Design a protein around this ligand. Structure first.
Ligand code: SAH
Ligand code: ZN
Lengths: 17, 204, 114, 54, 123, 249, 174, 216, 46, 408
């Protein structure tokens, strides 16, 4: 039944602008 | 059996339960003219033609006839194999076909159109035969009468034909109840016959 | 084929012989919950094995309770929410968790009596 | 609608359709009113103008 | 007496579960009545002349069985619990259609216990 | 009761669902904690029964095809109410157990017995006589007429049923019904008893149970069925059941 | 339990107190209750009690039928209650539905009888395949206690789990 | 206080009106008595208007079919039996159908007596092929449900097609309270709300006579 | 719905056959509702 | 306030299916000069799973096994009928369309069969775009000798089958199916253009079928379809399912992929149509000049593996250009801009050399199609085919120009 078959880059690297 | 295969568009094709009946069709706009000199009969949906049995003299010249079929409904409940298989199946089984001559060969749209019930031809599926019906006329007037007043009554598996006046028409309830009364009356007496005091008893 | 554009509309050009007092019954069907019964059978037509369907529904229901604990156990049952969501995923419309209420209740404290 | 200066033929059509208040008339579209018998497109502008003027 | 028989019947087949789709058996049971054929899965093709009217591994419905009666179908080979390649389990095709669900029996069904109940209960 | 429902008394339901009633009281802040939630249940505070109805809805229970799953509803009284086609009560706790109860053990996906595939819930006893009396048609032959004979017409089935409600006809009095569907009447496969053939082209075919009007000039085909309101009522009940379920789903 | 206006009522207007299923009699073949109820009705209307020794048929054929029908007729005649004895169907009478006022179609037997007041499951779950329901209804103390009793017979019952990933054997704490 | 309200209304077609109504709060046992009495009043005590006789003029030869008319005489009678009417007539009046020739004869073509109105103008009567003149005299009557070459028409007087009632019971402790629902289906000759009012008035008129006194 | 029109009598074996055909054609959810309606009709007429 | 504010198909088209358990959800059948189509009657909002668009019962289909032996599902041919002998005499590999055509003509002759009604909504002999109906003059407008020879062999095979099996001595029940060769050719044209091949499970039997499916043969083809077909074995219903998570706007056409990975010449041979945005069309280059495959894909934002290219101007033609252009790739070696310009210039010259092979141009063909007034359906199909190929070659020249400049 139901028991069958076992049931961060790109940050701090931006343009200074 | 005949050696050839006919051209079926020169014939009326009449389909019954056990045969296809072919009668030659002279060209006509209403397609209701019959040439009975050439007729064939075949097993259903087949092109192997043979001469049908003829049990009565057939018309020699062209005649105009109205066709109606005679039979029953086979309403069954077939087994349900596939999903959504139908709960019922309703088919028509035709055992006889009636060909009723138009009086004086008048057309359907003729204002003086009436049927000539004295000349009716019957096709039987069981025997693959064609014959003329024996008709009993009870209307007063003889051969010269108002054909607009007569009614044809068909009974006994399409074997008894009676022409009555339209004022003698039976109610459909009366027809059904007559058959039931006759059958139950005989069955009741058969049931009561084995009682040993039957011979000294009354019906009431 | 191409004529100028004018074209032949396709029609049946053939005969097909195959071509009101149930309000109380319809409203009772919804009241007793028979609608979900048909939905369950509808979902099981798309399932090869009904035992893995039961397991999958329970697995999805467990996820609902972990995500939002306080919203389930009363008027909204997690298993009913799963079934209604799966019917809506097929493109049909059902109320959320099949939850319905009596609009003719005469105020608080009153229980409908069977 | 009794307090709007509608022509009597328009008034009878709205009452025949059980349109009684101003809000009932507003919720009806312009196609619905044409579906009513004896109320046509030529009657929409004169009815709208009365509601435009109101 | 009915309960004691039911307990022994369940015990002898309690372990039988539908565990495979197809055991891949080649043998079948030959049959030459309608109720003993509905739901069976065919083990071989059936021909009427040169026309195959039913294919191998096709389940037998009421329409197919009536066709075998109408025409000259002398022998039909079906897959039964007697043909499966195991005694610790059975496959879907050797069991056939489920009575309670209309389709082929599903994987994981405890058909042994169902068989035990279906015989013990009418005792 | 519906086939999938059962009725539980308050005294039995509150014990079976006490853990859910306590949680419902705490969740909706009607009780501060576990200890307070018990006192309100003890003291029969009326807010308890409102919560009990909420938590019981959508929560099936097992009743011990000896054991089945039903959706419980609160009923008046002190007894357990079961539908006529059917003591231990088990409440599934885990969602895995609740899924199995609703999706595998309910009384509508087990309509066929595994032995041969027969239906389980066939009407019996008083249900069966009611159908038998309903579909026992009109008296016939010598039981209908004292003497050898050498009925109303209804446009639709609703007029026939309406005439029956107004005591104009009896349940087994014969009538003719105008039929505007195909010929789907189960009857003996028999040729007409009588054919009445008018000289203008119309002919009436009188069968044992229906009348068919046809013509050789037109394509008309009119069907009138000789039946009773009992047969009409039985046909309508099944048809409206199918139509009602389709509209609701 | 119904209000008196919902009960079926007789041709004298009195509603009945109890309604029994008539299908229980032919299967159980206890016709004596039919005799008693009819005679009880006659006695109440005639202000009589009856004490009848069993097997009254020793006097004559259909002795009970003669006693009951004759007393029913006497009750009907003396009290001017023709419904009590119907020549067409003795012992039965047409009664009315309290809800609608329409008569019931067939005549119904009525009377006044004397009524007293009185003082595999695992297999089914396995057949359904409800494995988690079965686990809940079983729960382990049943097996841990079994191990100790087997230990009293110098037998050890160890439960080992073999991992399908790394094939390592784990002895469960039992 | 005891009040009534309409909770559901619908008009499926010109001859299919549905309405559901509520009456609350009622004391125990009252809703059943009201529902039983109202249902009986709705089904047979409300007067409807129907065609009861038809008479084909021009001496149509008393046959089962008429030249130029597709339908037989019986089919015309069946179609006339299905025409829904409303009126305030006292006694009996005559209507008339006089159609020149080819086309569709519908209820729109009936010439009505003063108080009589037609509900569905599109209801079919007869199809005329030939340009013959058809003249049918009709007999119109207003009757309760429970009540010369002219063909009778067995009309069933039921402007209310169906009616049902159900009761809901509510309680808070010892205090009980029941709610009455009434469902009404009409054929369009009357609204469900109007049928509710006429059934109540007809019931009241039935019980007023018990309160009558006599002059001395 | 293309239900056949029975017109003679419905006994125990006739209703059992009809239910089995309804199950095979409409499914168990439809037939379960049909059973409830037929059950109610039988009780009312009895 | 509310007071102050392609033709629909024959209504009986959907009704004849609807009374036989055909269901359509949120779509409508619309008819135009180019034929039938299925369009979303409303905004089909995305869901977590595929939405059911249409449900077609199995009993309304005409199906035959792809592989021998020939069995029909549902079985409609009576035992002993001569039509089976005609079906059984076919080539198992090549004559699948002949087998379906025989079943189709047989189905039209049956009174109770659904395709007796549904056949009236099939395109006629002068409306079907199949090249089996194309005249020799229509094939002259293809400008493709390989495709023309393929069609001529198809027409020869179909005609010879009719002449062999519909001679004078055959029974009348066979003659009335295909009284003339054109009737049988039309049936084969319907079979080729409308057959749907799927793997289905019926009961316990899993098999490949060639299927004539009503209301699903009205879905048009797209190489980026918004719908797909799904067989539901339990109730024997074909489902048309919209892609999961994909929003479909009101009026948008519902499409399926008839032939994944197939070129326009294959679409023309089978279905008698072509698309200018076919992502599998190929062009014969010499290979002397090659561009950088990685750069070309990134310039036009074409991602995924070569067999599953997709776009995040760019359409199926640019994807086809990526697969058909001569390309080089050296893991992560960058391309020299001046060497890539020589390749782009030489590839454009070879593209113009092939456009100069056609007597007319793409826009001249487009205006010819607008000027037509008495043209056969296949003639316009033949012109659209050669015009689409010219549009594809022209798209490559534009794509190379854009790529050459975006490489700076
Ligand atoms: N994307 C597409 N572009 C042009 N024609 C197409 C197309 N998809 C399908 N078709 C046409 O539709 C046919 C497949 S059957 C699809 C329905 C068809 N339009 C009809 O009205 O019956 C093919 O023969 C093809 O000519
Ligand atoms: Zn096996």
């Amino acid at each position: 039944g139901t028991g069958f078959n076992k049931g961060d880059i790109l940050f701090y690297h931006r343009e200074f602008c | 059996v005949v050696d050839y295969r006919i051209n079926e568009d020169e014939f009326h094709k009449i389909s019954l339960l056990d045969c296809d009946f072919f009668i030659r069709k002279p060209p006509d706009p209403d397609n209701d003219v019959y040439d009975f000199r050439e007729m064939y009969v075949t097993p259903p949906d087949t092109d192997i033609y043979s001469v049908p049995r003829v049990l009565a003299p057939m018309p020699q010249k062209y005649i105009r006839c109205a066709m109606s079929d005679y039979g029953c409904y086979d309403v069954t409940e077939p087994p349900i194999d596939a999903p959504r298989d139908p709960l019922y199946k309703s088919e028509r089984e035709i055992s006889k076909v009636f060909l009723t001559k138009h009086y004086r060969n008048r057309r359907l749209n003729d204002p003086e159109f009436v049927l000539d019930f004295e000349e009716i031809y019957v096709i039987d599926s069981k025997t693959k035969s064609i014959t003329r019906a024996r008709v009993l006329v009870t209307v007063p007037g003889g051969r010269k009468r108002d054909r607009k007043d007569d009614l044809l009554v068909i009974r006994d598996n399409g074997n008894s034909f009676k022409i009555i006046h339209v004022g003698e028409r039976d109610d459909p309830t009366t027809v059904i109840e007559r058959e039931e009364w006759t059958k139950t009356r005989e069955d009741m007496e058969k049931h009561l016959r084995k009682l040993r005091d039957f011979s000294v008893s009354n019906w009431f | 084929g191409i004529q100028r554009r004018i074209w032949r509309r396709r029609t049946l050009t053939k005969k097909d012989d195959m071509l009101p007092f149930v309000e109380e019954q319809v409203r009772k069907i919804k009241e007793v919950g028979k609608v979900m019964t048909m939905d369950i059978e509808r979902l099981l037509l798309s399932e090869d094995n009904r035992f893995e369907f039961v397991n999958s529904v329970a697995a999805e229901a467990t996820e609902y309770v972990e995500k939002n604990r306080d919203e389930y156990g009363g008027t909204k049952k997690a298993i009913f929410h799963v079934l209604s969501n799966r019917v809506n995923d097929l493109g049909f419309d059902r109320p959320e968790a099949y939850a319905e209420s009596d609009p003719y209740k005469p105020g608080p404290g009153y229980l409908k009596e069977y | 609608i009794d307090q709007l200066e509608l022509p009597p033929r328009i008034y009878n059509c709205l009452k025949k359709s059980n349109i009684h208040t101003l809000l009932d008339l507003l919720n009806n579209s312009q196609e619905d009113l044409i579906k009513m018998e004896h109320f046509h497109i030529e009657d929409v502008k004169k009815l709208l103008d009365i509601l435009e003027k109101k | 007496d009915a309960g004691y028989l039911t307990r022994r019947l369940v015990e002898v087949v309690q372990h039988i579960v539908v565990r495979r789709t197809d055991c891949g058996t080649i043998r079948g049971i030959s049959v030459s009545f309608i109720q003993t054929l509905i739901g069976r899965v065919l083990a071989d093709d059936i021909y009427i002349g040169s026309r195959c009217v039913a294919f191998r591994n096709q389940d037998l419905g009421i329409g197919l069985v009536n066709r075998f009666i109408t025409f000259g179908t002398q022998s039909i080979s079906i897959r039964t619990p007697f043909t499966c390649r195991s005694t610790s389990w059975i496959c879907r095709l050797c069991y056939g259609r489920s009575p309670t669900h209309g389709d082929l029996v599903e994987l994981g069904e405890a058909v042994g216990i169902i068989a035990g109940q279906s015989i013990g209960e009418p005792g | 009761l519906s086939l999938h429902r059962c009725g539980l008394p308050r005294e039995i339901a509150i014990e079976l669902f006490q853990t859910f009633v306590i949680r419902g009281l705490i969740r909706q802040h009607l009780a501060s904690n576990i200890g307070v939630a018990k006192s309100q249940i003890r003291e029969k505070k009326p807010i308890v029964w409102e919560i009990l109805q909420e938590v019981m809805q959508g929560h099936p229970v097992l009743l011990n095809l000896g054991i089945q799953s039903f959706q419980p509803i609160l009923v008046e009284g002190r007894t357990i109410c079961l539908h006529p086609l059917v003591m231990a009560v088990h409440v599934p706790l885990s969602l895995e157990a609740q899924a199995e109860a609703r999706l595998l053990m309910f009384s509508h996906m087990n309509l066929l017995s595994p032995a041969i595939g027969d239906p389980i819930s066939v009407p019996t006893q008083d249900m069966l006589i009611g159908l038998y009396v309903l579909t026992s048609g009109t008296r016939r032959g010598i039981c209908a007429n004292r003497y050898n004979p050498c009925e109303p017409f209804f446009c639709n089935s609703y007029d026939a049923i309406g005439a029956y409600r107004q005591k104009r006809i009896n349940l087994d009095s014969p009538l003719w019904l105008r039929w505007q569907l195909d010929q789907r009447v189960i009857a003996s496969k028999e040729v007409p008893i009588e054919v009445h053939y008018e000289s203008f082209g119309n002919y009436h075919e009188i069968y044992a149970h229906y009348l068919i009007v046809r013509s050789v000039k037109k394509e008309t085909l009119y069907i009138y069925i000789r039946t009773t309101v009992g047969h009409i009522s039985f046909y309508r009940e099944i048809e409206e059941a199918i139509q009602g379920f389709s509209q609701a789903c | 339990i119904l209000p008196r206006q919902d009960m079926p009522y007789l041709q004298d207007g009195r509603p009945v107190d109890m309604v029994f299923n008539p299908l229980g009699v032919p299967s159980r073949m206890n016709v004596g209750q039919i005799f008693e109820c009819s005679l009880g009705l006659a006695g109440s209307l005639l202000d009589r009690h009856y004490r009848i020794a069993p097997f009254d048929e020793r006097y004559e054929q259909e002795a009970s039928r003669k006693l009951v029908f004759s007393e029913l007729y006497e009750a009907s005649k003396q009290t001017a209650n023709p419904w009590v004895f119907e020549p067409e169907y003795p012992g039965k009478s047409r009664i009315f539905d309290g809800r609608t006022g329409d008569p019931f179609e067939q005549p119904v037997i009525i009377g006044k009888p004397y009524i007293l007041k009185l003082i595999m499951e695992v297999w089914a779950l396995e057949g359904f395949g409800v494995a988690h329901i079965l686990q809940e209804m079983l729960t382990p103390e049943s097996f841990r206690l079994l191990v100790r009793e087997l230990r009293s017979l110098a037998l050890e019952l160890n439960h080992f789990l073999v991992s399908e990933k790394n094939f390592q054997i784990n002895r469960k704490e039992v | 206080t005891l009040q009534w309200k309409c909770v559901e209304s619908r008009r499926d077609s010109k001859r299919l009106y549905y309405g559901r109504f509520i009456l609350s709060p009622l004391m125990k046992g009252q809703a059943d008595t009201i529902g039983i009495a109202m249902r009986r009043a709705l089904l047979g005590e409300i007067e409807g208007t129907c065609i009861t006789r038809a008479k084909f003029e021009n001496i149509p030869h008393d046959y089962s079919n008429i030249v130029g008319i597709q339908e037989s005489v019986h089919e015309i009678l069946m179609n006339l039996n299905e025409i829904v009417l409303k009126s305030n007539l006292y006694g009996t009046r005559n209507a008339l159908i006089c159609v020149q020739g080819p086309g569709y004869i519908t209820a729109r073509d009936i010439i009505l007596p003063p108080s009589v109105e037609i509900v569905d103008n599109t209801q079919h009567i007869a199809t005329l092929t030939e340009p013959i003149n058809l003249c049918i005299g009709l007999k119109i009557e207003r009757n309760r449900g429970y009540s010369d070459r002219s063909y009778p028409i067995d009309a069933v007087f039921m402007p209310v097609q169906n009616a049902n009632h159900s009761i809901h019971s509510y309680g808070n402790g010892n205090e009980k309270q029941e709610i009455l629902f009434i469902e009404i289906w009409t054929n369009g000759s009357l609204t469900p709300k109007e049928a509710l009012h006429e059934a109540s008035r007809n019931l009241i008129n039935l019980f007023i006579p018990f309160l009558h006194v006599e002059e001395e | 719905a293309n239900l056949v029109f029975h017109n003679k009598v419905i006994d125990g074996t006739a209703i059992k056959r009809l239910i089995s055909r309804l199950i095979d054609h409409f499914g168990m959810a439809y037939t379960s509702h049909i059973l409830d309606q037929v059950k109610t009709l039988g009780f009312q007429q009895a | 306030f509310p007071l102050f504010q392609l033709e629909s198909a024959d209504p009986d088209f959907y009704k004849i299916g609807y009374v036989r358990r055909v269901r359509a959800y949120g779509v409508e059948f619309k008819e135009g000069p180019d034929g039938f189509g299925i369009y979303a009657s409303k905004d089909i909002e995305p869901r977590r799973r595929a939405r059911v668009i249409m449900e077609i019962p199995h009993e309304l289909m005409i199906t035959i096994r792809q592989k021998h032996p020939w069995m029909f599902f549902p079985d409609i041919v009576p035992i002993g009928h001569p039509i089976f002998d005609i079906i059984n005499s076919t080539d198992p590999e090549r004559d699948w369309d002949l087998r379906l055509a025989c079943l189709l003509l047989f189905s039209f002759d049956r009174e109770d069969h659904f395709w007796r009604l549904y056949g009236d909504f099939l395109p006629a002999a002068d409306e079907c775009s199949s090249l089996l109906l194309a005249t020799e003059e229509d094939l002259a407008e293809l400008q493709d000798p390989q495709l023309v020879s393929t069609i001529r062999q198809q027409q020869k095979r179909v005609l010879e089958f009719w002449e062999k099996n519909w001679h004078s001595g055959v029974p009348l029940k066979i003659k009335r199916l295909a009284e003339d060769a054109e009737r049988f050719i039309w049936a084969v044209s319907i079979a080729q253009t409308r057959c749907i091949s799927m793997k289905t499970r019926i009961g316990a039997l899993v098999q490949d079928l060639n299927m004539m499916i009503p209301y699903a043969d009205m879905l048009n083809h797209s190489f980026e379809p918004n719908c797909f077909l799904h067989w539901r074995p339990k109730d024997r219903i074909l489902e048309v399912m919209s892609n999961a998570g994909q929003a479909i706007k009101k009026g948008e056409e519902m499409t399926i992929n008839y032939m994944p990975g197939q070129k326009n010449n294959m679409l023309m041979e089978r279905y008698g149509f072509s698309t200018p945005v076919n992502p599998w069309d190929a062009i014969p280059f010499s290979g002397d000049s090659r561009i950088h495959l990685n750069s070309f894909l990134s310039v036009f934002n074409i991602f995924g593996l070569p067999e599953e290219y997709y776009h995040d101007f760019v359409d199926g033609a640019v994807i086809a250009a990526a697969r058909t252009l001569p390309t080089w790739s050296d893991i992560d070696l960058p391309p020299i801009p001046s060497a890539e310009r020589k390749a782009v210039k030489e590839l454009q010259d070879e593209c113009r050399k092939m456009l100069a092979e056609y007597p007319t141009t793409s826009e001249q063909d487009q205006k010819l199609l607008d000027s037509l007034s008495e043209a056969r359906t296949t003639f316009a199909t033949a012109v659209k085919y050669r015009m689409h190929r010219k549009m594809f070659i022209g798209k490559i020249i534009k794509a190379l120009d854009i790529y050459q400049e975006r490489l700076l």
